[PDB]
Write a protein that binds this ligand. Structure first.
Ligand SMILES: N=C(N)N[C@H]1Cc2ccccc2[C@@H]1NC(=O)C(=O)Nc1ccc(Cl)c(F)c1
Ligand SMILES: *[C@@H]1O[C@H](CO)[C@@H](O)[C@H](O)[C@H]1NC(C)=O
Ligand SMILES: *[C@@H]1O[C@H](CO)[C@@H](O)[C@H](O)[C@H]1NC(C)=O
Ligand SMILES: *[C@@H]1O[C@H](CO)[C@@H](O)[C@H](O)[C@H]1NC(C)=O
Ligand SMILES: *[C@@H]1O[C@H](CO)[C@@H](O)[C@H](O)[C@H]1NC(C)=O
Ligand SMILES: *[C@@H]1O[C@H](CO)[C@@H](O)[C@H](O)[C@H]1NC(C)=O
Ligand SMILES: *[C@@H]1O[C@H](CO)[C@@H](O)[C@H](O)[C@H]1NC(C)=O
Ligand SMILES: *[C@@H]1O[C@H](CO)[C@@H](O)[C@H](O)[C@H]1NC(C)=O
Ligand SMILES: *[C@@H]1O[C@H](CO)[C@@H](O)[C@H](O)[C@H]1NC(C)=O
Ligand SMILES: *[C@@H]1O[C@H](CO)[C@@H](O)[C@H](O)[C@H]1NC(C)=O
Ligand SMILES: *[C@@H]1O[C@H](CO)[C@@H](O)[C@H](O)[C@H]1NC(C)=O
Ligand SMILES: *[C@@H]1O[C@H](CO)[C@@H](O)[C@H](O)[C@H]1NC(C)=O
Length: 339
C-alpha cells in the first residue's frame, strides 16, 4: 500500500563520458547509469487518480533543464534585472538525449496505461516502475518536437478547457516530420522548414474534429498569434545550438481544412530566455548546412475568449511556459510513498 507523495528524484541516462555534446556532459555528472533490466509491475484491480497539472515531477524536470542550460548555454551578453553580464560564448555541440526520472528507496512511480487518459482523473490500468521512460528535454514553442505519441486517439489536455487562459496541449497520435535547414551557401540567418502538406493538413483536420467533440461542434478556426514576444508568436526551438524562429502562418491554414509547405525561418542571436530571466545574446551561426529533422508530436494552443456568443471557437499557436513541455511527457506518472 502507498500514498501520494513528493520527494527528490534522481536521473538516469546512457550519456557518453567521452562526448563533448552538452546534454551528455551534464548527464555524465548529474545522472547515474540506467537499469538494463527494468521491472514494471501491473497492479491488479487498482484504480489510481492522476493530475498532470499538479505534478511535482514537472517542476523537478524544469529545475534540471534550467541547470543544464545555465551551465551549457551561457550567452556573450546577458541582460537581467537591470544588470549586464558579459562572458565567453563558444559554439557548442548540442543534441538532447533521453533522461529518465527515478524514485529513491521507499518510493515508486505509478504509471497510467489507459490509452485515452486525458491527464486528470481515475486510471484503471496502472503499473509501478522505478523510472520514467527516457524523456528528451526539447525546448520549443508552438510545436512539441521529438516527444512520445498518443497510443490511440488524439488527446486534448488542459488544466481547464472552459478557461480560455489555460493552454491546451494537443497530443498527436501520428508524427508529422518538420525538416528545418539553414542552407550552406547570402543571408546567413535565413532558414526554412519543410513539411509535407498532405500529411499535415490531414492531421490538423483530425485535430479539428477532436476539438469539435469538446466544443459542441462549433466551427473551429485557426488564427496566427495575436501578439507577444517573437519566441511565442513564432515556432522557436534550438537546432545544433542555434536558435530558430519559424513563421507558422502556413501551418494553420483554414482553407486546407497538398504540396510542400515551406515556413520562413530566421536564426536569432538575441533571445528572450524561457527561464524568464531576461535577454541573452549569442554569436552568429556556425558555417555549413544547419539541419534538424524532427517529429511534430504535439501542438500548444490558446483559445480566444469571448466567442461564447458565436458559433466559432478560435485557436492560435502558443506556449512559452516550458513546464508545459515536460507536462506533455510526464502526464502519466505520479510518485507515491510505500508504507
Ligand atoms: N519572455 C518572458 N518574459 N518570460 C518567458 C517565461 C514564460 C513563462 C510563461 C509564459 C511565457 C514565458 C516566456 N517565454 C519565453 O520567453 C520563451 O519561451 N523563450 C524561448 C527561448 C528559446 C527557445 Cl529555444 C524557446 F523555445 C523559447
Ligand atoms: C494495461 O496496460 C498494459 C501496458 O500498456 C498493457 O500491456 C495491457 O494490455 C493493459 N490492459 C488492458 C486490459 O488494456
Ligand atoms: C478529463 O477527464 C476528467 C475525468 O473524467 C474530466 O472531469 C475532465 O473534464 C476531462 N478533461 C478533458 C480536457 O477532457
Ligand atoms: C519520430 O517519430 C517516429 C514515429 O512516427 C519514430 O519512429 C521515431 O523514433 C521518432 N524520432 C525521434 C523521436 O527522434
Ligand atoms: C488518431 O486519432 C484520431 C482521433 O483523434 C483517429 O481518428 C485516428 O484513427 C488516429 N490515427 C491513428 C494512426 O490511430
Ligand atoms: C474553469 O474555467 C471556467 C471559466 O473561467 C470557470 O468558470 C470554472 O470555475 C473553472 N473550473 C475550475 C474547477 O476552476
Ligand atoms: C530536409 O530538407 C532538405 C532541403 O533543404 C533536403 O535536402 C533534405 O533531404 C531533407 N531531409 C529529409 C530527411 O527530408
Ligand atoms: C457533430 O459533428 C460531427 C462531425 O464529427 C457530426 O457527424 C455530427 O452530426 C455533429 N453532431 C451534432 C449533434 O451536431
Ligand atoms: C508570418 O508570415 C505572414 C505571411 O507572410 C506575415 O503576414 C506575418 O507578419 C508573419 N509573422 C511574423 C510574426 O512575422
Ligand atoms: C492557405 O493555403 C492556400 C492553399 O491554396 C494558400 O493559397 C493561402 O495563401 C494560404 N494562406 C496562408 C498561407 O495564410
Ligand atoms: C507527402 O506524403 C504523401 C504520402 O502520404 C506523398 O505522396 C507525397 O509525395 C508527400 N509530399 C510532400 C510534399 O512531401
Ligand atoms: C529530433 O531528433 C532528431 C533525431 O535524433 C534530431 O536530429 C533532431 O535535431 C531533433 N530535434 C530537435 C529540435 O532537437
Amino acid at each position: 500500500v502507498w500514498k501520494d507523495a513528493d520527494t527528490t528524484l534522481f536521473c538516469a541516462s546512457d550519456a557518453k563520458a567521452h562526448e563533448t555534446e552538452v546534454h551528455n556532459v551534464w548527464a555524465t555528472h548529474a545522472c547515474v547509469p540506467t537499469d538494463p533490466n527494468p521491472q514494471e509491475i501491473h497492479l491488479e484491480n487498482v484504480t489510481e487518480n492522476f493530475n498532470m497539472w499538479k505534478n511535482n515531477m514537472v517542476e523537478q524536470m524544469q529545475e534540471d533543464v534550467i541547470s543544464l542550460w545555465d551551465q551549457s548555454l551561457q550567452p556573450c551578453v546577458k541582460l537581467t534585472g537591470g544588470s549586464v553580464i558579459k562572458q565567453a560564448c563558444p559554439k557548442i555541440s548540442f543534441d538532447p538525449i533521453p533522461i529518465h526520472y527515478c524514485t529513491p528507496a521507499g518510493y515508486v512511480i505509478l504509471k497510467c496505461n489507459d490509452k485515452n487518459f486525458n491527464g486528470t482523473g481515475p486510471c484503471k490500468n496502472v503499473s509501478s516502475v522505478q523510472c520514467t521512460h527516457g524523456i528528451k528535454p526539447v525546448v520549443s514553442t508552438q510545436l512539441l518536437l521529438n516527444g512520445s505519441l498518443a497510443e490511440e486517439e488524439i488527446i486534448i489536455r488542459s488544466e481547464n478547457l472552459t478557461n480560455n487562459a489555460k493552454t491546451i496541449i494537443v497530443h498527436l497520435n501520428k508524427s508529422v516530420e518538420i525538416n528545418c535547414t539553414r542552407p550552406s551557401n547570402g543571408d546567413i540567418r535565413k532558414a526554412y522548414c519543410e513539411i509535407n502538406g498532405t500529411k499535415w493538413n490531414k492531421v490538423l483536420k483530425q485535430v479539428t474534429e477532436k476539438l469539435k467533440e469538446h466544443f459542441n461542434n462549433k466551427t473551429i478556426i485557426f488564427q496566427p498569434p495575436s501578439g507577444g514576444d517573437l519566441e511565442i508568436t513564432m515556432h522557436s526551438f534550438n537546432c545544433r545550438g542555434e536558435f530558430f524562429y519559424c513563421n507558422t502562418t502556413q501551418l494553420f491554414n483554414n482553407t486546407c481544412i497538398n504540396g510542400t509547405i515551406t515556413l520562413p525561418c530566421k536564426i536569432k542571436q538575441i533571445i528572450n530566455m524561457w527561464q524568464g530571466t531576461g535577454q541573452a545574446m549569442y554569436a552568429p551561426p556556425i558555417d555549413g548546412k544547419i539541419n534538424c529533422v524532427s517529429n511534430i508530436t504535439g501542438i500548444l494552443l490558446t483559445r480566444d475568449g469571448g466567442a461564447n456568443n458565436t458559433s466559432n471557437e478560435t485557436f492560435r499557436p502558443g506556449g512559452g511556459n516550458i513546464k508545459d513541455n515536460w507536462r506533455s511527457e510526464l502526464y502519466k506518472y505520479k510518485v507515491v510513498q510505500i508504507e
